[PDB]
Amino acid sequence: AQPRETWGKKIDFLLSVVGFAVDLANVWRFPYLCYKNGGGAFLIPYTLFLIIAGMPLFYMELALGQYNREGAATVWKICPFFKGVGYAVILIALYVGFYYNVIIAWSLYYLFSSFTLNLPWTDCGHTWNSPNCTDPKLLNGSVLGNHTKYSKYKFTPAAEFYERGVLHLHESSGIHDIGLPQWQLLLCLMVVVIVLYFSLWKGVKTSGKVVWITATLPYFVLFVLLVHGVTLPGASNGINAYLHIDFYRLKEATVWIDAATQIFFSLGAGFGVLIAFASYNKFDNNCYRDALLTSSINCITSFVSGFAIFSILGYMAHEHKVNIEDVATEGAGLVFILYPEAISTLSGSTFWAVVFFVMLLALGLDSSMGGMEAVITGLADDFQVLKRHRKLFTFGVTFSTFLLALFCITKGGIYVLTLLDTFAAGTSILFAVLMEAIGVSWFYGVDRFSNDIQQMMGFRPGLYWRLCWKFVSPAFLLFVVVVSIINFKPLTYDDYIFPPWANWVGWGIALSSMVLVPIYVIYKFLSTQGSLWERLAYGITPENEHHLVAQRDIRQFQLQHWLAI
Amino acid sequence: AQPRETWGKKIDFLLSVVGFAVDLANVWRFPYLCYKNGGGAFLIPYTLFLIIAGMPLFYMELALGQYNREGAATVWKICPFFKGVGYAVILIALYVGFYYNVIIAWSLYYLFSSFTLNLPWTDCGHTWNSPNCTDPKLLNGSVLGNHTKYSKYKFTPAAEFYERGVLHLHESSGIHDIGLPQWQLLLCLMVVVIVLYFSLWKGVKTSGKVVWITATLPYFVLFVLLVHGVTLPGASNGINAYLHIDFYRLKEATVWIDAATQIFFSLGAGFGVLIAFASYNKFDNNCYRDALLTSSINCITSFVSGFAIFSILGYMAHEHKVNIEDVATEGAGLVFILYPEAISTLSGSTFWAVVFFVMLLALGLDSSMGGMEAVITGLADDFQVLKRHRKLFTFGVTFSTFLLALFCITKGGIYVLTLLDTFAAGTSILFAVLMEAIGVSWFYGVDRFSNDIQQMMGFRPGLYWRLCWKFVSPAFLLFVVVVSIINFKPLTYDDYIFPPWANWVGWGIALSSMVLVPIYVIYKFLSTQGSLWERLAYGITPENEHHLVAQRDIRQFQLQHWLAI
Numbered sequence A, B: 001a002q003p004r005e006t007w008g009k010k011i012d013f014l015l016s017v018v019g020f021a022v023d024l025a026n027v028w029r030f031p032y033l034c035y036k037n038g039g040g041a042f043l044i045p046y047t048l049f050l051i052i053a054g055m056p057l058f059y060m061e062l063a064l065g066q067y068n069r070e071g072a073a074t075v076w077k078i079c080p081f082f083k084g085v086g087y088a089v090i091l092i093a094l095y096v097g098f099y100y101n102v103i104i105a106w107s108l109y110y111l112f113s114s115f116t117l118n119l120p121w122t123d124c125g126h127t128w129n130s131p132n133c134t135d136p137k138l139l140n141g142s143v144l145g146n147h148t149k150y151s152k153y154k155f156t157p158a159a160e161f162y163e164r165g166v167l168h169l170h171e172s173s174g175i176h177d178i179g180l181p182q183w184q185l186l187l188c189l190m191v192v193v194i195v196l197y198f199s200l201w202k203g204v205k206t207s208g209k210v211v212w213i214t215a216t217l218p219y220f221v222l223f224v225l226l227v228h229g230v231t232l233p234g235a236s237n238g239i240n241a242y243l244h245i246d247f248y249r250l251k252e253a254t255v256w257i258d259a260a261t262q263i264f265f266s267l268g269a270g271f272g273v274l275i276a277f278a279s280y281n282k283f284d285n286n287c288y289r290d291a292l293l294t295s296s297i298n299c300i301t302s303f304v305s306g307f308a309i310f311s312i313l314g315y316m317a318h319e320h321k322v323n324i325e326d327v328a329t330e331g332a333g334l335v336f337i338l339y340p341e342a343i344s345t346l347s348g349s350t351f352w353a354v355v356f357f358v359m360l361l362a363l364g365l366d367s368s369m370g371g372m373e374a375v376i377t378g379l380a381d382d383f384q385v386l387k388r389h390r391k392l393f394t395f396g397v398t399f400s401t402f403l404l405a406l407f408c409i410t411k412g413g414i415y416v417l418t419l420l421d422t423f424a425a426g427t428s429i430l431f432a433v434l435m436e437a438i439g440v441s442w443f444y445g446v447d448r449f450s451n452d453i454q455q456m457m458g459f460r461p462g463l464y465w466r467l468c469w470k471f472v473s474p475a476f477l478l479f480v481v482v483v484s485i486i487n488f489k490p491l492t493y494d495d496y497i498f499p500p501w502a503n504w505v506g507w508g509i510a511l512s513s514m515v516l517v518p519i520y521v522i523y524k525f526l527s528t529q530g531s532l533w534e535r536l537a538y539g540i541t542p543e544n545e546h547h548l549v550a551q552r553d554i555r556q557f558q559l560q561h562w563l564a565i
């Protein structure tokens, strides 16, 4: 038979795509970036690159998943030369998990630390926190002053518990000496992969069943946190500072460059996750309304998450006597630095901390389930043997992720967690989707894509989407790729500086995913027999239409195909 | 078809079974252990445990390979319950290579260093050697004194070049801080695996073609080295010290146990290598004469290698004015410490050094080819899919060995090379051969084994072999296992105290191979349907004789089977 597995409960697909859209990025990247770019001057470019990019790629991916009901790697049965591109979106799907699951363990250790009456991030001292030699200072009892940002000030109790209490960074000095993997983090990383295996072994049914909770919990958590925080003193400061009427902070090195990255990273369009989640769906399904609703809910959730984050920041600035400029933070780990301390500052800190940490666990587990579904599903469709042994392939993928995420849970965990995040999703996931858009628009045609969409739902997409898919979106992706490649800085942590070979290793990891396109192109060209004008016809023409290759009448070789809008 | 691949040239099988036994062990273990256990009082226990063990296991393995023409794992088609034991002899076959190939790279770097007019081990100084500020001392220019053994004296030029010049141990502090893998060793470890892949991809033909040289070279090398060394002043000292008329150093402890492990480690009997090299052989082949000749050549080669080693040691003691007690050496690396320096002490050091290093390279390549061939043949005869794609499976095995031997080529390479060597072949390979002998003698029967041997050649083995296979060899193996388990000392590499978790990791690595027997027994018991008295019949009875299982007439359940000699 065929693994259709259509969602009997229609709400399952919507909840799944919403969960895949809303992740920790919407929590910790949107608020800081919005203020750093201007606040009110960040929402307009966000909406601009949200209607010219994202939503177009989201619609394209949904249509490719529904019409071409197949896997992520095998979605290119209409353009075999770009099939290797699918492999890329699988590898990028794995490397990211190598650190992403670790970010879930960091959300579990704290969750285990929150089952107490006194929280460790409240005050200094050995409370599962390793204090330094008189360096940790109690800000509540010491009003002397501060000379660094709260993200850069590694002497606060919360930052101390994050660096030494959880990660144990005090016994690591770089990637050259990583040390031994922490066992308290190994248990928290093993429970996560066990849950992922037990939730992704039967198929998409249990996946949607777990999504039903892991997606609905964070919205309620954020709503309750906003209701509690808006009344706290300081929220009016942070909300009105990050959202100001005179939001004019635009330069050429600003929102027009930075909003281009957050959109793609927060939406999730252009990935095997959407191709898989749309393959297990009915053929006559409206995906335009889904493409609009998912992106709108994603943007509204990012907006309210920034609201809550800056309310927390304003409360912290009104309680620690610091200015809003110093409350702006950077780095990968931020939901663990400022938010647990702010929860501790309020009464009943245990309940709010447990709720926030179970929200972060639900979000992380849902995102990891999506990422591992992009791998387990989409690769089995290529190798028919893996389809029947789905439990075994799921176990193998989970065990490989567990055994290859040990470098990110070591003593220098953040030193091997800011290296994969920077290169795996930094540039590879951009060239991959650029090649995808090119193969879909210029090689498969936008008119044929529109006809397929009309056969799916019943209406042909307007000229706007047809022009954005071939002209606007590919140019946008190429521009972002050029900006990422040319404007490249050496990877450096808050204070640590990576050795020169670290950049080489990161670029090699990026190339491992990026060069999958030309390698597979050469493989397909050499593995086929015929003339030089016939091997080209195998790779730019649909498989199910290969019978027309003998007829010598191919639409692609005509001029009307490339100039169709 | 069937991959018979019988040795058309009969000399190929002999060279393969002989070269596989003669390796670096026969070079660096037999001489020191012989003198430590008595010298002339060590040849007698050697011959004793060479006729009650080894030769019996060698004959058994050759007969199992010739009669049961299959792989190492699937040689148990007559006793399925012990088939998992085969898996052990595969895994132990891989872990060893993880360090063994590294020992080949150490024989290549020196080989590349010997293409000069002045050798680096001659005198101190930066000559591809990293010395200390004032630790290295010129023995020719400084006759002050010495207070440590030449093995542990890390201030000699050759020892300095071995520790810091090649391995770069100065920038390592143990297994907790291994550092980055050395590239000068990475290239030498990659060339070796490339040669292994290009020599083991076609099959056993190119394997025998390469063995034709890699086995014939070391004998000529040792012969020329002995001819050159016997005339040097000092050889009469070392030869007469390690071989003395009053050789009486007898002790109840550590005099018969050391030979018991050295015989097994230097012969190779009881391994998938013999089962593989005998599977690709004619059915009507004399293996008794082969089992005798291979072991005799192995012992004679070990004897002459000890002769040459102690000739070199006596020359060094007569030249450096040290006593023979201080020239006795320990540790894994010895052919690189004393032998290159002794070659340097003679005129024309470049030629003798190149010859000795190409001999070491030939021996290492032969051993690695034998091990990888055993692995590939076992995993191919177990999984029929891997038989046709032999090139791809060979490439995968070589690439996995290259990517998993990077811990042994690091700055602290000898710290990850004395851990696998101690636990992989220390105890697991002994319990494996114990289970093999038990399943062959008590479960398959020695009378049936003798009948199979008679069907192979034409004569039934005598009562001596039939009694040693069931009584002497299993008791010997159990005694060696008990001594290795009870008399266990923590790993100490030149007074370096390994952390407590190192012993746990080593025992876990040993268990990964050892527990393959009960796990597979439970798997076979649960994976079969029937009564409790019928599931036992599937696993202790031959597969091709399973038709008798339904007939309720099984020889194993009778008393005459267990009491047959």
Ligand SMILES: CNCCC[C@]12CC[C@H](c3ccccc31)c1ccccc12
Pocket (backbone or CB within 6 Å): A020, A021, A022, A023, A092, A093, A094, A096, A097, A100, A101, A265, A266, A267, A268, A271, A273, A367, A368, A369, A370, A371, A372, A374, A425, A429
């Ligand atoms: C909006 N994105 C949220 C999901 C994060 C995600 C989804 C697939 C893969 C991945 C690659 C690039 C970017 C983001 C991801 C991944 C693997 C494991 C966990 C999470 C992921």
Ligand SMILES: CNCCC[C@]12CC[C@H](c3ccccc31)c1ccccc12
Pocket (backbone or CB within 6 Å): B020, B021, B022, B023, B025, B092, B093, B094, B096, B097, B100, B101, B265, B266, B267, B268, B271, B273, B367, B368, B370, B371, B372, B425, B429
């Ligand atoms: C006396 N014969 C020496 C061969 C050394 C050998 C043969 C199989 C495996 C192995 C296990 C235990 C002991 C010795 C070995 C191995 C893998 C790679 C290189 C060499 C080996």
Ligand SMILES: [Cl-]
Pocket (backbone or CB within 6 Å): A026, A030, A262, A263, A265, A266, A267, A298, A299, A302
């Ligand atoms: Cl977003």
Ligand SMILES: [Cl-]
Pocket (backbone or CB within 6 Å): B026, B030, B262, B263, B266, B267, B298, B299, B302
């Ligand atoms: Cl020997």
Ligand code: NA
Pocket (backbone or CB within 6 Å): A018, A019, A020, A021, A022, A023, A363, A364, A366, A367
């Ligand atoms: Na999510």
Ligand code: NA
Pocket (backbone or CB within 6 Å): B019, B020, B021, B022, B023, B024, B363, B364, B366, B367
């Ligand atoms: Na050898």
